[PDB]
Structure formats: C-alpha cells, structure tokens
Write a protein that binds this DNA or RNA. Structure first.
Ligand code: SF4
Ligand SMILES: [Mg+2]
Ligand SMILES: [Zn+2]
Ligand SMILES: [Zn+2]
Ligand SMILES: [Zn+2]
Lengths: 443, 58, 46, 459, 130, 45, 86, 43, 166
RNA sequence: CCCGAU
DNA sequence: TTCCGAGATCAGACGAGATCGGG
DNA sequence: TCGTCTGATCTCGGAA
C-alpha cells in the first residue's frame, strides 16, 4: 500500500509541517519504534522528535503502549491519517444535522485534536460572537445545550484513559482554572451517518422517494443500538415504523406496508452486508462507465450476473461483434477488473485446457480501485503543490499588469477545480472502504 | 578502465553527469577494471542493480 | 567502389614461394593457392 | 569570474545490491525500444534507425559514434534503453522469491499472516546492531516456517492455503486458483511498508512490486557487439500481444503467447530452464566471473620453450633477444637514468639496449620511436616523462608454469638478455616449477609499475 | 443465424416505453409490464424496416437480456411457459458518478513522481483545467 | 600433495573429509577395551 | 516494422472521458472549508518552524525579525455522555 | 535481500581492482617529511 | 570579508619532498582556491593559516603524499550590511555597473531606489543630477555545471545624502 | 568443436 | 475419537584441473 | 554422468 503512504506524506505536509510529516511518515514505514530509535534512523535531533510526536499524539495519529521492555514503542495507525482528507465533509453534515454552532463544535474538535468541554465552548464563544452583531452577543448557554445534543446522538466520544507511563510526560501535550477531561470527535459515528446518506440516496435514486424515507427513519431510530461492526441493523417492527415517520408524510399504514414488503424483497435487499456490497459494484460500474464506454460497461455487468460462464456466451449475451468485444475483455483483464481464468483444470497447458472462463472478483477489483484512488489524490495535491510557489509575487500585490492578473484568475480557477475534485474522489473512498471494512473479519 | 558514477543513487553515469537525477553534482569518477564495469552493466541489464556507494581515499 | 583486401603473409621469418596454383573451384570462382618454403636448421629449443 | 570546481576520483566503500522498480527503469534509460523486430539494419548501407540498436544506446563499430555522447567506441560507456512489456511477466531470477512471498503474504489483503506478537518478535530481531547474511537467510526460513502453517490471517480473517508452483513458471493457489503475473502485480502493490522488511527485502534497495517485469532494461550496445536476437524476439512478441488484442482471438492463444512471452523473457536471462543468455555470461569457466574477472589475460607477457642453462645464478632467467626487444618496462626519467635512457633511445627499437616508445610528460601518445629522429627525441627528453625501454638485464620478470599447483610455480627472476629464443634458467630451480625440458613451455610476465617490481623481487 | 444485424438499432426501440412512464403516481402497487413488452414486440414496435417479421419469443427476448446489462428490469416469473406474473421495472441509476480525468488514463498511471510522465506537468490535467 | 577390510586413503578420502559429508564410504570406529589380553573376552564385546 | 516508427504516442487519448466536476452545487460549502482550514492549519500553534534557517544565518543583527470580548458566564458540568472503556 | 556487502577479502578486491588488504596491503605507509600542526595568526 | 574553515586533501607530488609541508601545501592551496567563488560561501582569495595539518599518507598508487589539511582561508562575502566603495566600470541602461577596485567587476547594481532623477540613457550618463559608495544587498550565486556570473550581487544606493560628492 | 602440446 | 507433530520416503538440482597450438 | 543436498508429501503413535 505504498500509494497510501504517498498520501500520508502529502496530508501532513500541507497541514502541520514537514518534520512532523517526516517523523510521522517514517513511523508509518517502520512501526512500533521507540523514541531514541526514531531520532537515530530519520536523522532528526531528539528535541524536534519530542515536539513532533507531541503534535502527533494531540491529533491522535500516533498511539503509544509498552509491553515488555519497559520502553514505550510509539505506533501510528495508518487509516486515521487519511481521514484528514474527509475533514471539510465532516464539517458539513454537522451543518445539515445541527446548527452553525454545533458545526463549529466538530470543527475545532477536528482541528485542535484533544479538547475539554471547558475550552471548546470558550473558543466558539469568541468565533461566533465576532461574526455576529456587537451588542447582540451570542449567549454561550445555547452552545452547552447543543454540545450535549451532539453527544446524546453519540457524534462525539471521549478519549480512552491515558496510560500515564513514566516515559510519557503529562505537561508537554496540553497547549498553554479547571482541568476537565479530553475528547476527540467520534468520526466512526460519521461513517455510519455518511453511510446513512449513502443508502438513502441509493434507494431514492432507484426505487421512489417514499421508499427512501422509511429507510432513513429505520436507520435514524437504529443509531445507538448498533455499531459499525454490526453485520446488519437491529430488527424492527412495522408498527413503530408508522410511529417514527416524519410529519411531512401522510401515507396510510397499509399502502406503505405494501411498499414495506416491496422494499424488503428486491435484488438490492435492512441488510447492511448486502447494502454496501451492492453499492460497491455500482461504484465499479460507474468507473467502467467513466472509462470504457457503455459497451464495455455492458459486458462488465454481464460477469456480475453469471459467475463462471464466459467467452462462450459473452459474444452472444451482448450481441456486440467478436472483434469489438474481445478487446473489451482484455482491457478489463489488463487493468485487473476482469480478474482471471480460475477454472482451467487441464494440466499445465495454455494451449490445451478446459477453456479459461472470466470471472469478476469483487474485492480484488475493489482493493485495486481504492489503491488507484489513493494514487489519484497524490496527483491532485502535487499539482496544487506545483502551482503555488510560482504565483506568490502577485498574491501580496492585492494585500499588476494584465497578464499578471490573468495568471491569478487562471490559478484560482485551477486550485478551486483541484480542491473540489479532491472531495469528489473522496466519496468513492468511503463508499468502497466501508465495503472493505464490512468484509474484514478479526479487525 | 575509468568510469564515472555518482554519489547519491550510485550508478554508472556517462562522462560528466549521471542521467538518472540529472543534477550533475555528485558524479565522481572511479577507477575500475573494464571487465568489472561490464559486470555492473550486464548485471543492471537484468534486474540486479549494484548500487555503488563510494568513499574518498582516506 | 573497390576496397582492396590484400592477402599478406604475416609469419615471423621469411618464406620463399614455391608454387602458385590457379584454378576454379566447384562454383567457378578463380581460386589461387600459394606454397611457402622455409628451411630451419634445428637450433636451441627444437 | 571563475567558480570553484572539484576534480577528484574516489574508491568503492560498499555495494548495495538492489532492484529498480519499473518507473526507475524508464528514467534510467535514454530511448524507447518500441521499434521493429528487425535488427534496425536498413536495405541500403544497413544503417540504424530506431530498432534495438539506436546508437543513443551504444556503439558496435569504431566508425559510428553513439548519439547521446559524442564519443566513439573507445572512451564511451554504454547508455541504456528500455522496452515496455505489454503484459507483465515473471522475472526468472526472482521467481523463487515470488513463491517465497506469496507463501508468506495473504492472497486477499496482502498482509503477512502473523500475530502482532510474532511480527514484533521478528522485527525485534531485525533491528539488531549486528546483521549478517547468515542472520538474514536464517530468518527467511523461520518466517516462512510460521507462515506456512497458518490458514487464517489475523488482519483480514480470510482463508489462505499453499502455493504449489505448477509447471513451468506458473502458480497455483488452492478447480484451484492460478496466479498469473497479472494478478501478482497489484498484490505486491498492496503489501504495506510495515511488512516489507519482514520479507527481508531492505526497502531502500527494492520493494516487492518489482520482482516481476512490466518494463525491461535492454543492455547497452557496447556490451553486445546473439542476445540482441533475443531482444528482437521480445518486441516481435510484444506486438503479437498488441495485435491480437485488437484483432479478436480466443484466450487460449492470447494466454499462450503471453506464455510464450513469459518464456522468452525468461529465456533471455537463463537458457537452461540455441543461444546463451545473461546467466550463461556469468557461469562456468567461460563467464565473466571465472575467467574474465579473476583469470584475465595479461599484457607484457610471453611464452617460449624452455631449455637448460647451468651457467646462470639460481636467480636469473635467460630471456631471448627478440622477446626482450618486445616486452618493455616504462622507466620514468629520474636524474639517475637520464644519461642511461638518452644512451639507449638513440638505439631505438632495433638494437637491443634501446627503447620503442616515449610518452611525453603529459599523456602525449606514446611516440613509436621508429619513424622520427631518435637524437632529436634524445635531446628533447626531459625529466618526468616515460621511456618504454627494452627488457634489459637486471630487470625483474616472473615465471609461471601453467599447471600451477603450489606457491612456487610463480617465482620472480632477474632477467639477463641472452642470444636465443628459449627461456633458459638454472636447473636447480626446476622442481619448484615441476618443469622438465622435454618440450615444456612456461610463461614470463613483466611487471610494469615500480611497486610491483619490488613485490616480485622481495616476496 | 442473423449475424448481419445491428441490435443496437433495436435497443432504443425496446427502451422508449420505459423512459416515458405515464402515471408515475403511487395510487397502487404499480406492478409493471413485461407481457405488454412482449405484446409490443410481436405486432409492432416503433417503426423500423425489419426483415425478420416472423415473431418468435426465442429471438425477441434476447434484446432484453442485453438491456438488463444496460440497466433495465429483471425477470420476475419467466418460469411459466407463456403467461405468469412476469414483474418488471426500469432501473434509474442508483448512484451519481464517481470519476475524474486521471481515472480515465491507463498509461498515465505510471509516474509516481516527476519523471517522464510526472503529474506536475501532464497533458490531461492541463486539458481538464480549461 | 593432493596432486602427488578396506579404508579409503587417497584424494577420495581427503575430498571426503573436506566436504564433511554426513554419510561417508567406509566409516570406521576403533575401540579399546577394558581387558585387552584375551581374544575370548573381546569376542564377547 | 509495423510499429518501428517512434514512441507509440506522446499520450493516448481515451474517446470517453470524465463526466464533469460531479456534485456541482453543494461542495461550494465544503470547498471553501478546504481552503479555510488550510489557511488556519498552517497559521496554527500545532506546526513547526525552520530553526535550520536560523542556524544557517551567521548574519544576525538588530532591527530585523531574525533578532526580534469573550462575553461568558461561569458554569461547570462534566458529562459522561460518552464511552466508559479503554 | 538488500545485501550491502563491504568490499573485503581478496575475491572482491581483485574483482573491483582495489589493492587487497591481505599481505602487503594490511598496513599503510606514511611519509616522514617536515611538518607540524603550527600556530595560527592573531585575527 | 570573513574567515572560512575548510578541509581539503592536498596532494604533494614527490619531487617537492625537500620543502616543508606547511609551506608546500600552502603553495598548492593557493593554486586551488584563488579567484574562485565557492557556492553559498563566497569568493576565496588566499590562505590565512593552516590550523591543523594531519599525517602524510602515501597511497598504493601515486607515490605522492596526501595530507588531509584543515585550514582557514579569507574569503570575500558581503554581510548584507556593508557600505562598500567601488568604481563605475561600466554603465548599462537597465542599471549601472560598479566594480570594487581591481577586486571583481562582477557586482551589478540594479538602480531603482535613488532620488527621482534616475535614468541611464545609453550615452554613459551616470545619474541625472539632484570613488562611489555601494550598498551590497542580496547574496546570489548560481552553480555553473548543468550538462555533459556565479556571484553577481544586487547593489543599492539609498538616500545617503553623499555630502562630499552630490 | 576436433586434433595436438605439457 | 481426535490429531498434532514427527520419522520415512522421492525428486530435483548444478558441480566436476590448468593452460598453449593449429585447422 | 551419477553424485550430492533439499524439502515436500504420507502414516503409524502419543497426548487431552
Ligand atoms: S496527472 Fe499524473 S496521474 Fe493524473 S493522469 Fe496525468 S499522470 Fe496519471
Ligand atoms: Mg614435461
Ligand atoms: Zn545519479
Ligand atoms: Zn555516449
Ligand atoms: Zn485471510
């Protein structure tokens, strides 16, 4: 997963600094490594490594635990570092589900890492009042009201109890009264909630508008009683479905009951195992639609129908000519979508065999496209890394000839086209990574 | 024989500068038998890459 | 258009021509064969 | 105006053997070799165009200079070209390590099947301050021990099996799964950099994704003036794999020429899995190791038949005149042999105490002392410059009788120029050489530097 | 037998009743047609000059099994010989789209840094940025 | 000097020693006894 | 000879391409925050500085940088709305 | 393996063309000319 | 001007074995580092002292003597706070050329900052009026090797007043 | 590859 | 009943002086 | 040309 590590080098470089990236990315490359061993292998002085790990434990990227030697081996979790890419999307759904106050709550909780209640409410009392009218001061009591209102739906969970090992020092991590207790954001709750938007958009854009809302109210009343490791949601009765409907609807119980047995019986199938398994194939199909036209996408859906029945029917079952079809198979083979010939049983003969049958394997085509999408955002940021250092002469002139200004508006057209496009490929990551996490046992 | 390698990425670069990492600065000549240079250049032809790391004469 | 390929006698010592034969081979191409005498009294080493 | 510049040579400290990933293969090569399966020789005056002998690659003949330098065949190195294989194929050199890694890593998540304890037990071993090849190859056994016992991972929980090496260069994983090198490339892409040192690949040298070949360096033209014929056989097949994809053919032949390219890429390395390959240039008593790097041919060295001479001291060999006028010793001019070298350079290369080459003090080409005025070269001879005077008496040659069985078969000897063409030595020193005079020959090397002259005489 | 035929001319003709869909209102079950699609297949579709006026169900159903792969309704009760429930429904796309210009290029995947195909100067993002 | 009952003694013995093979041809273990004065007692051993 | 002409192509053009800047309307909200926090993450306390510049500078001299209403009321509530683990 | 070998012994120093350290290359030689670590100038 | 501690491996050829090393190294090191700008360092001039000279090896090849030499050499490198005094050895219409007296004619002042009577109009007009002083302002050196100048300066002239000469 | 020398 | 581990029994490897001389 | 070492499957045997 080298392209994954390419992003963690890119994500820390833009956010904090360079040595916090370097000591950071080395820890991703060599793992459970002590404090002196990291400073000797990266060639970094020990005073800067203590600072760089201090920022890294604050934003919860490096976790420390000692087992046997009495010497703490730091360890960085890889998949947390890529969640910085989703950071402005984590802001936005707290604006759709909470006000501007609580949206700023998850913001400075994502920004400054570990926060106590006594600090984060004091900070938003500065930012929200300075943008509101002076003399019309925003009262902080409503912040404490919406602060717990996030926590009752469990969007913010507290930090695990600190080990307080001798090697670890308490004074350095806090940045400089009451002590309180710290927390990060519960971004795992978001990955339910981002999946809640994913299934409700999967039904509404396929079945009907009224079908999706009963999926939403099913999932909105199954939030605390499940977790992300739940194979499917908690089972509900249809009578509390009629109780939990929104007030915008007026549908009679028996007609929605017909839609309830309609929605329960589909090819799609609430089976949370089958939901992410069906949404991932549409993400695959939207990539071959993006890349190889509707004709090759037509045979790409054909192998998702029959598992191992190929090349004696695919020239027939899509009616496209043998010349035009077989270049689409080998292009789906060479780009690892078509997977392979796992049926040949004649012994050691490419020429004489029982005829190789194509078969898509959904996860090998998944893990590649996730590795491809990790590679994709490397080419996005590095371009925005490229176009920045040249144009610095004219950013401060506003703070100017006609080609001088025209380079700026072609820059600002470019960066805003790049930065918007970092997020549109980001929604493909989570839609596929949640499918990856759903088929992974013992993790 | 007389050959030119570079300090970083250490590999045979022709004459004054090494084509991989065009930066031309680290390139420092060695003294080698030609048959050993032909060993390195036919080793590097298959995927074995002898990456020499030079040192100055002490 | 003619590059001459002169057939020279290398040797170390001198040699006298005894016969020079001129003929066609099977595919008739003018073969020419020399024959070089050399007399050596047996000195140290022989 | 002038900016400082350093002009200093260096020496080898160590060699770090590694690989090049196929993105590094491209930007260490100067030309694409996508061109013809023909030899690039055209119909008229057989020149070279884009081919497999572009001439930016190297040089095969003295007249044609290479293009990416200006230099001719003499003092130009090779330059590299690269071919792009369409379908990636196994490298037969690293092929046992691909089965060695596919037995260790999971075939679903590309993590190594170990606990977090056994991983930490082996990574504790790897950060040892003392590390040997023995302490590396011992672990690759032991890590492949503990990993070829498990069937369920800890990191994905999916089910693995055995990797059985079916047939020639093919893989089977337990109607069982077959791992062609198409699926191996992305599996080796998903090994984490955590688990790269656990397969003992030092990732500064090379990650496991480049054990298989999707690009390929072609060797430079200066080290092949029959392996060119195996290169054009690839690019022929690299078009047959390119044509039949857009032509329409059943997969039992597109999987056959991919098999035929798999062998042909492997046949270019080893040819005994007719034309020798890159293995056979490094093998046996003919390859570069055992016969061109250790046992290499040597200038200033002669060979005659030996005959006895008891009238010499045990330390002297009688060298013939004709040999002693050919084998030359570069004796630099040093205020004590100025009148002696002036006296002998008037003789030139026909009278025996004479010379046949003069370098000037600054790498001027050796001046063959036959054509010019020798007395004008005698008077102009100054300090410092080199005279290649003849093998004179009092010089140190060293014998060798070619079945060298002990230390005494090479021995130095002082050299006295006698009148014959036999190497004549005293017969007391013939049992070290195991040399009778029944028509036996023995070689005579002549050491050139003054440091190698004392190492002959004393030792 | 009919290899000299373009069913890509007929794929729109078996599609355009499923794009219009009069009465999208949810007054009832809306168990939707497959037999009328076999009915419109037999007598007359939208107009086209057709040599194979003979109407067999074995040669006409195959245009559907391509168009399911072009995102149109699944088979409900085709286990009956000629007439059973046969439920069908045209599937509108369940997702949006998900790609970018760099998802299109196979050869441009090679790069990994500033090299011969380095993304700091690729043609494709230069084309996409206008 | 390499160039210059049954037990192997020649170069195929010295080649056999230098290789240090696990199984050799003609391996011989000599053994002294406690009572080395009578052929009957050493018969019994 | 059929391909022995030049590098295949400078680039290979795919007849089908990317759709658009997909999800056009609503990522105006996230897209400004992409640039908003990056304006504030770089100008934060949780960053490092190039003290290698100052050890590189032997030109240190005076007169250069190299040389040089929260309206709220008290309360205290500590909730265990969160997990009781780890 | 990423095998970093140093160049020692004689089967590698002969291949690389380094004077081997076995025998006459074990030690090294100095020169005995007039030298001293001298005092500097007052600045 | 600034001292620069440097370390070099200085090779004395064996026909100089009569002379003392610390002199005969110094004759070599002047021929190695005179009139040569070192990148990011400045214009070396001569040898100040040899602070530490270590032991004279003699390698298996050359027969010469290679002493690793620690020394200090004086170099020319303005400190970005120096008001120098040079001479105008040239006038270009984009900016004047000043030269320090027989030191280096490579200091090229851009001229935008003196009093609003500034132009060089190609008839060698120095300045439209109201030894020459100079304020060296930036360090700027470009490493020359690039394929198979170099300390240029930018030089200012603020409102000094220049009481003696305008 | 043969031959032949030792 | 289970079976986890271990001694037994094939198959594949890659080695096997040095030089010199000529057709 | 065997000759060697290696390492890869089977099976009768003990422990829980
Ligand atoms: S930009 Fe970099 S990544 Fe995107 S396509 Fe061009 S090369 Fe491939
Ligand atoms: Mg004899
Ligand atoms: Zn280089
Ligand atoms: Zn060249
Ligand atoms: Zn598994």
């Amino acid at each position: 997963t080298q392209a994954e590590i390419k992003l963690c080098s890119l994500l820390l470089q833009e956010h904090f600094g360079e040595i916090v990236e370097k000591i950071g990315v080395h820890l991703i490359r060599t793992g459970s490594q002590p404090l002196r061993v990291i400073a000797h292998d990266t060639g970094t002085s020990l005073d800067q490594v203590k600072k760089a790990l201090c920022v890294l434990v604050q934003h919860n990227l490096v976790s420390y635990q000692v087992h046997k030697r009495g010497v703490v081996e730091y360890e960085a979790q890889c998949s947390r570092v890529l969640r910085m890419l989703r950071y402005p999307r984590y802001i936005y759904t707290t604006k759709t589900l909470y006000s501007d106050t609580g949206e700023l709550i998850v913001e400075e909780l994502l920004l400054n890492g570990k926060l106590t209640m006594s600090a984060v409410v004091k900070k938003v009392a500065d930012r929200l009042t300075e943008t509101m009218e002076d003399g019309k001061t925003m009262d902080y009591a409503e912040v404490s009201n919406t602060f717990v209102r996030l926590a009752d739906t469990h969007f913010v969970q507290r930090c695990p109890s600190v080990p307080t090992t001798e090697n670890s020092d308490p004074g350095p991590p806090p940045p400089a009264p009451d002590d309180g207790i710290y927390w990060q954001a519960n971004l795992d709750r978001f990955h339910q909630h981002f999946r809640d938007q994913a299934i409700v958009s999967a039904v509404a854009n396929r079945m009907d508008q009224t079908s999706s809302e009963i999926v939403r109210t099913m999932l909105r009343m199954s939030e605390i009683t499940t977790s992300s490791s739940a194979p499917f949601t908690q089972p509900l009765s249809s009578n509390e479905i009629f109780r939990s409907l929104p007030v915008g609807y007026n549908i009679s119980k028996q007609v929605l009951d017909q839609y309830l047995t309609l929605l329960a019986d589909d090819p799609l199938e609430i089976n949370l195992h089958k939901a992410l398994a069906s949404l991932a194939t549409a993400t695959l199909e939207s990539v071959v639609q993006e890349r190889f036209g509707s004709r090759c996408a037509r045979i790409f859906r054909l192998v998702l129908q029959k598992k191992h029945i190929e090349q004696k029917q695919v020239e027939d079952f899509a009616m496209i000519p043998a010349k035009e079809a077989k270049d689409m198979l080998y292009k789906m083979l060479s780009e690892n979508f078509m997977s392979l010939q796992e049926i040949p049983k004649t012994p050691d003969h490419a020429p004489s065999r029982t005829f190789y049958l194509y078969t898509v394997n959904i996860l090998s085509a998944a893990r590649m496209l996730l590795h491809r999408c990790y590679k994709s955002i490397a080419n996005l940021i590095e371009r925005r890394q490229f176009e920045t250092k040249e144009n610095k002469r004219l950013l401060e002139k506003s703070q100017i000839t006609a080609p001088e200004r025209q380079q700026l508006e072609t820059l600002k057209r470019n960066v805003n086209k790049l930065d918007a496009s970092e997020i549109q490929v980001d929604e493909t990551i989570f839609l596929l990574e949640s499918y990856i996490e759903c088929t992974m046992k013992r993790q | 024989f007389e050959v030119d390698v570079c300090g970083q990425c250490g590999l045979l670069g022709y004459s004054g500068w090494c084509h991989y990492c065009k930066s031309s600065c680290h390139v420092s000549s060695l003294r080698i038998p030609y048959a050993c240079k032909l060993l390195f250049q036919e080793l590097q032809s298959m995927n074995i890459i002898p990456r020499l790391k030079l040192s100055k004469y002490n | 258009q003619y590059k001459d390929v002169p057939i020279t006698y290398k040797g170390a010592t001198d040699s006298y021509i005894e016969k020079v034969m001129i003929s066609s081979n099977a595919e008739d191409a003018f073969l020419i064969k020399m024959l070089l005498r050399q007399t050596r009294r047996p000195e140290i080493g022989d | 105006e002038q900016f400082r510049e350093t002009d200093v040579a260096k020496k080898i400290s160590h060699i770090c053997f590694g690989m090049k990933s196929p993105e590094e293969m491209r930007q260490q090569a100067h030309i694409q070799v996508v061109s013809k399966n023909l030899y690039s020789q055209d119909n008229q005056h057989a020149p070279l165009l884009y081919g497999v002998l572009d001439h930016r690659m190297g040089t095969s003949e003295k007249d044609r200079p290479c293009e990416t330098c200006g230099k001719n065949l003499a003092d130009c190195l090779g330059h590299y070209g690269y071919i792009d294989l369409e379908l990636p194929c196994f490298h037969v050199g690293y092929f046992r390590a691909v089965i060695g890694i596919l037995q260790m890593i999971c075939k679903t998540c590309c993590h190594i099947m170990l606990s977090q304890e056994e991983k930490k037990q082996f990574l504790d071993y790897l950060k040892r301050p003392g590390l040997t090849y023995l302490q590396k190859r011992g672990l690759k056994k032991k890590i492949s021990d503990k990993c070829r016992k498990k069937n369920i991972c800890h990191h994905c929980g999916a089910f693995n099996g055995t990797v059985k090496k079916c047939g020639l260069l093919k893989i089977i994983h337990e109607a069982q799964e077959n791992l062609n090198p198409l699926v191996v490339l992305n599996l080796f892409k998903r090994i984490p950099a955590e688990d790269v040192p656990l397969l003992l690949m030092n990732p500064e040298a090379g990650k496991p994704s480049d054990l298989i070949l999707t690009r390929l360096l072609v060797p430079p033209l200066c080290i092949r003036p029959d392996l060119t014929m195996k290169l054009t056989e690839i690019i022929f097949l690299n078009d047959v794999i390119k044509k039949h994809r857009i032509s329409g053919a059943k997969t039992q032949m597109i999987m056959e020429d991919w098999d035929f390219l798999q062998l042909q890429c492997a046949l270019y390395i080893n040819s005994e899995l007719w034309t020798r390959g890159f293995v056979q240039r490094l093998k046996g008593k003919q390859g570069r190791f055992r016969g061109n790097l250790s046992g290499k041919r040597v200038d200033f060295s002669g060979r005659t038949v030996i005959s006895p001479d008891p009238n010499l001291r045990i330390d002297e060999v009688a060298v013939p005149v004709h040999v002693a006028k050919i084998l030359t010793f570069p004796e630099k001019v040093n205020k004590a042999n100025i009148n002696f070298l002036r006296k002998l350079v008037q003789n030139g290369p026909e009278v025996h105490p004479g010379a046949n080459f003069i370098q000037q003090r600054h790498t001027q080409m050796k001046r063959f002392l036959k054509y010019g005025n020798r007395e004008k070269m005698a008077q102009e001879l100054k300090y410092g410059d080199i005279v290649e005077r003849h093998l004179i008496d009092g010089d140190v040659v060293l014998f060798n009788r070619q079945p060298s069985l002990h230390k005494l078969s090479i021995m130095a000897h002082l050299a006295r120029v006698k009148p014959h063409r036999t190497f004549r030595f005293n017969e007391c020193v013939c049992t070290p050489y195991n040399a009778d005079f029944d028509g036996d020959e023995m070689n005579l090397h002549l050491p050139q530097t003054e440091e190698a002259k004392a190492e002959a005489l004393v030792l | 037998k009919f290899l000299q035929s373009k069913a890509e001319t007929a794929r729109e003709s078996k599609q355009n009743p499923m794009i219009q869909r009069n009465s999208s209102f949810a007054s009832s079950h809306e168990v939707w047609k497959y037999i009328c699609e076999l009915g419109i297949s037999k007598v007359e579709l939208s107009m086209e000059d057709i040599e194979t006026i003979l109407n067999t169900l074995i040669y006409d159903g195959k245009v559907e099994m391509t168009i399911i792969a072009a995102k149109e309704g699944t088979v409900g009760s085709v286990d009956g010989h000629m007439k059973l429930y046969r439920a069908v429904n045209p599937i509108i796309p369940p997702t949006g789209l998900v790609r970018a210009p760099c998802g299109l290029c196979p050869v441009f995947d090679d790069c990994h840094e500033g090299g011969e195909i380095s993304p700091s100067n690729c043609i494709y993002m230069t084309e996409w940025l206008e | 000097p390499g160039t210059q009952m049954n037990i192997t003694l020649g170069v195929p013995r010295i080649k056999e020693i230098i290789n240090a093979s696990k199984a050799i041809s003609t391996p011989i273990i000599t053994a002294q006894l406690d009572k080395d004065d009578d052929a009957d007692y050493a018969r019994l051993v | 000879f059929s391909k022995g002409e030049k590098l295949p192509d400078v680039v290979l053009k795919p007849p089908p391409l990317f759709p658009d800047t997909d999800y056009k309307p609503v990522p105006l909200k996230t897209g400004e925050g992409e640039e908003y926090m990056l304006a504030l993450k770089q100008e934060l306390r949780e960053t490092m500085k190039r003290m290698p510049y100052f050890i590189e500078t032997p030109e240190e001299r005076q007169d250069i940088e190299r040389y040089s209403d929260w309206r709220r009321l008290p309360r205290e509530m500590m909730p265990r709305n969160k997990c009781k683990k780890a | 393996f990423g095998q970093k070998d140093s160049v020692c012994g004689v089967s590698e120093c002969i291949i690389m063309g380094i004077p081997m350290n076995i025998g006459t290359g074990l030690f090294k030689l100095l020169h005995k000319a007039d030298r001293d670590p001298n005092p500097p100038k007052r600045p | 001007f600034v001292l620069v501690e440097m370390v070099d491996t200085v090779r004395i050829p064996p026909w100089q074995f009569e002379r003392k090393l610390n002199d005969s190294i110094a004759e070599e090191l002047n021929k190695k580092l005179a009139n040569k700008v070192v990148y990011n360092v400045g214009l070396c001039i001569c040898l100040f002292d040899i602070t530490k000279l270590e032991d004279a090896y003699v390698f298996p090849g050359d027969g010469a003597s290679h002493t690793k030499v620690h020394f200090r050499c004086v170099v020319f490198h303005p400190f970005l706070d120096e008001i120098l005094i040079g001479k105008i050895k040239g006038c270009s219409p984009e900016g004047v050329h000043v030269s320090l007296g027989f030191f280096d004619d490579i200091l090229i002042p851009p001229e935008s900052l003196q009093q609003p009577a500034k132009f060089d109009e190609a008839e060698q007009v120095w300045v439209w009026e109201y030894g020459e002083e100079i304020r060296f302002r930036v360090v700027d050196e470009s490493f020359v090797d690039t394929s198979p100048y170099t300390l240029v300066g930018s030089i200012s002239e603020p409102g000094l007043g220049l009481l003696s000469w305008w």
